[PDB]
Amino acid sequence: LPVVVEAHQVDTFDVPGVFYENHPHEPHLSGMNEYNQLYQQSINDPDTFWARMARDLITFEKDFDKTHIGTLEGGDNAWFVGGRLNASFNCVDRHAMRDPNKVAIIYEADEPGHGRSITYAELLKEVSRLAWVMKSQGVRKGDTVAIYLPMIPEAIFALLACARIGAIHSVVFAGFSSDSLRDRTLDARSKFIITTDEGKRGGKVIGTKKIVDEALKQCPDVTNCLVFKRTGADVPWTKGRDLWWHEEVDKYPNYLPAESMDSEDPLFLLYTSGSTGKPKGVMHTTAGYLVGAAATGKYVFDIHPADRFFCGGDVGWITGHTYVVYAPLLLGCTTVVFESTPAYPNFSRYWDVIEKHKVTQFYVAPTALRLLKRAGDHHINHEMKDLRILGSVGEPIAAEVWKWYHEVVGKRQAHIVDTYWQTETGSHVITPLGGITPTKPGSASLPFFGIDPVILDPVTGAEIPGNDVEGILAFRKPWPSMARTVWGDHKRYMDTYLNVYKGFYFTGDGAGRDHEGYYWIRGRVDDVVNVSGHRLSTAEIEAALIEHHCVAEAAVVGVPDPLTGQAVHAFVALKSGNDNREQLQKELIMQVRKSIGPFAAPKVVFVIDDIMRRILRKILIIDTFHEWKKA
Ligand SMILES: CC(C)(COP(=O)(O)OP(=O)(O)OC[C@H]1O[C@@H](n2cnc3c(N)ncnc32)[C@H](O)[C@@H]1OP(=O)(O)O)[C@@H](O)C(=O)NCCC(=O)NCCS
Ligand SMILES: COP(=O)(O)OC[C@H]1O[C@@H](n2cnc3c(N)ncnc32)[C@H](O)[C@@H]1O
């Protein structure tokens, strides 16, 4: 009956009464009334609103002159212009100064019962002397630094040592292949790379040093490669280029000055798959990104200094950037660096970790939940008394999963916060406010401060006003943590995000606003599919399949999946007869595993004789492929 069909007979659930009774502190807003009043000031007077929020949350060396200049259509937005600051001062120094022995990082190793806790003073030392290593090898303010690290505290050391000297960290997910590492290191023109000898994830060795050596053969501008001894296994060593982390840091002082950065100096690049082309180097600058990180960490996740915050995402992706690293450290609480998987050594792992370290907020993807919900409710017998916020990212936590998350995991004592955002937005843009906003299962609820969502007619591009509407999801106004460009290709940035509907920011997502104003994300309207919370281009995989000598044309599409959410399925037509078609589905799968990485391997590759991508999506020579699907 309603135009937003996902919103038929879905009421709001209030924040549970237990949330306030057991809360160790006072929440940051007095209620929905204060959200609405702050939200309206953030739309009608962002200059006043964001100036106060930034001076509340971020310590500037030099105060800023003006909250914002530029427009969406101009592609010239700058926030807190005239300000100077350093992101690692804000994540480390100011907290070490006040409370040197407060724990900043809880590292949880691949094996239980290992790991360690790291104080803000220890973090300041490790950031400083790693920054010393890079400066000593020639890394300067404004250079990019490639980072190919797993989930160990050393990764936080590396991002923040980069920020400390004004280098621009460019993190590459440790599940990427050599080709993908190479592409990103070249496009970013990094001359320094930081990696491990090997990874350990779920009991499994990841030959990270061997991958780096292969990529580096095609990166002749990389002149130093700093290697952290994670396992101590014999790895290949290239003298005059490779350096041991532990040998070099021991040479240098335990303190280094922080470099004074402009508000709009680049902070990092994060290569991101999109609808067309190779991955884009999404660039975030410094003050606005950090303001958005801290403001969502504070208001969305109810972070207080004493909290122990646990994001489950990998540092290789934007959730790891913003909520494993920047948001919790800016706010001065403790952050958990989880090296393992939710299934190692067993399916109780997430809750082993949450009970041992008394985690207050946990932040995960629905893929992980579905993998766990199928494992059974018996892997979950933990008190976890301090756990009051349950975050979800990447896709709608649907009703069955949202119930299992609320009752079995949270014991109806925690608030579930379905945060909608994307790499380009820097931090949450549509999300309930932890402990404040009444929620609906499967809805991202309401916009964050400074976010002005509109629903657009997909064809005419016009604004569809009022409630119970559906169409393209766009934002009407700029916001502090928006991405500022695509590295080396601002026109692509304009063409992708700002020239599609001039005057608006184009999210790439379809959405609907229900009778109450709550938003329901329908997913991508372009050829980006979300597999296991990993953001993938169907074009990228098609490009990888064509890299096989037998493939002529290739086509990849995304069909709904009960565990992976969406399952990538590939089709390929061969140039010549393959007498071993069974052997070919192995080499085509390995090809994608080599061009991108294991995590992008298609489920099955179909071979047919003979682009209307929509027909393949609805099916999973038109009658011949329907028989082909049946096999
Ligand atoms: C749920 C999850 C833990 C499953 O882990 P998994 O057991 O490795 O299974 P996956 O399907 O994801 O990965 C398949 C392949 O990717 C590889 N892979 C995944 N993560 C990797 C990593 N961090 N490093 C190296 N390789 C990785 C696996 O080893 C595997 O390779 P293989 O086929 O040779 O064995 C993982 O997919 C995940 O983290 N999803 C969440 C994404 C997200 O939204 N995070 C934000 C959370 S706030
Ligand atoms: C993590 O940011 P990424 O850039 O990896 O993801 C970018 C892409 O994820 C999707 N998405 C993220 N959160 C939600 C969410 N709560 N609900 C629904 N869909 C979501 C969306 O399609 C976005 O365009």
Automatic annotation (TrEMBL):
Pfam families: ACAS_N, AMP-binding, AMP-binding_C. Keywords: ATP-binding, Ligase, Nucleotide-binding. One of its GO terms (molecular function) is AMP binding. Signal peptide: none annotated. It is an enzyme of class 6 (ligase). It comes from the Eukaryota. GO terms for cellular component: cytosol. This is Acetyl-coenzyme A synthetase.
